[PDB]
């Protein structure tokens, strides 16, 4: 029940060093273990007892403990090290094994690619059913993270928005989609709606009108 805290994300280029820290809870009183979780796979033990390496784990993975905080260091990073890393401790104060929240390590092994954005208005068929759905399809971006913002005319709109998690395409770039639900009266009262997709600090915007 005690909080083991990790930074949510780390980006690193091939060959560089990634560092993931972990604090709180029983760090300093019980040893820290580290697990690697590759996408779609079960976790794998990569460090135990603060700094020991299981058989088969590359020497590039090393852990350390500074008393109040623990650090997993991944030297000479490879694209195969892209994963979520979890620290773990026995929590004395609550009698629980506890895990950190996880750190997403992104390895930048490809050039940056801006997303392609296709935005669809509500179909007439849906409108005649007293519903309205705006569909924003986002594809071919790298690295795999975007933020989507919808605008009514030019005003922000947070309600009615459902955005997927990004998923890897067979070309190793990423796709996602976002849906804005409105009433037919909302859709027709405004001059336009916009889907603004931000990727690495650059925005690609698409707009539709009744």
């Amino acid at each position: 029940q005690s909080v083991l805290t990790q930074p949510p994300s780390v980006s690193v280029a091939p060959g560089q060093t990634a560092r993931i820290t972990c604090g709180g809870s029983s760090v300093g009183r019980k040893s820290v273990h580290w697990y690697q979780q590759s996408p779609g796979q079960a976790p794998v033990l990569v460090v135990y007892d603060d700094s020991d390496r299981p058989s088969g784990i590359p020497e590039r993975f090393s852990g350390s403990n500074s008393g109040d905080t623990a650090t997993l260091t991944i030297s000479r990073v490879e694209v195969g090290d892209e994963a979520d890393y979890y620290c773990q401790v026995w929590d004395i104060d609550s009698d629980h094994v506890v895990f950190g929240g996880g750190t997403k390590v992104t390895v930048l092994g490809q050039p940056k690619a801006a997303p392609s954005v296709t935005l669809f208005p509500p179909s007439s068929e849906e409108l005649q059913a007293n519903k309205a759905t705006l569909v924003c399809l986002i594809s071919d971006f790298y690295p795999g993270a975007v933020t989507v913002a919808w605008k009514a005319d030019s005003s922000p709109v947070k309600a009615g928005v459902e955005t997927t998690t990004p998923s890897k395409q067979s070309n190793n770039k990423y796709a996602a989609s976002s849906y804005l639900s409105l009433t037919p009266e909302q859709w027709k009262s405004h001059r336009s709606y916009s889907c603004q997709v931000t990727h690495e600090g650059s925005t690609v915007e698409k707009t539709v009108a009744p």
């Binding site: 009183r29 019980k30 040893s31 273990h33 697990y35 796979q41 079960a42 976790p43 794998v44 033990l45 135990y48 007892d49 299981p54 773990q88 026995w90 094994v97």
Partner: peptide, 18 residues
């Protein structure tokens, strides 16, 4: 069973695929 004063031990060395 780990004792109160034990610092080391008690990791998860094998996981199934879920």
């Amino acid at each position: 069973s780990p004792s109160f004063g034990d610092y080391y031990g008690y990791w998860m060395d094998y996981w199934g695929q879920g």
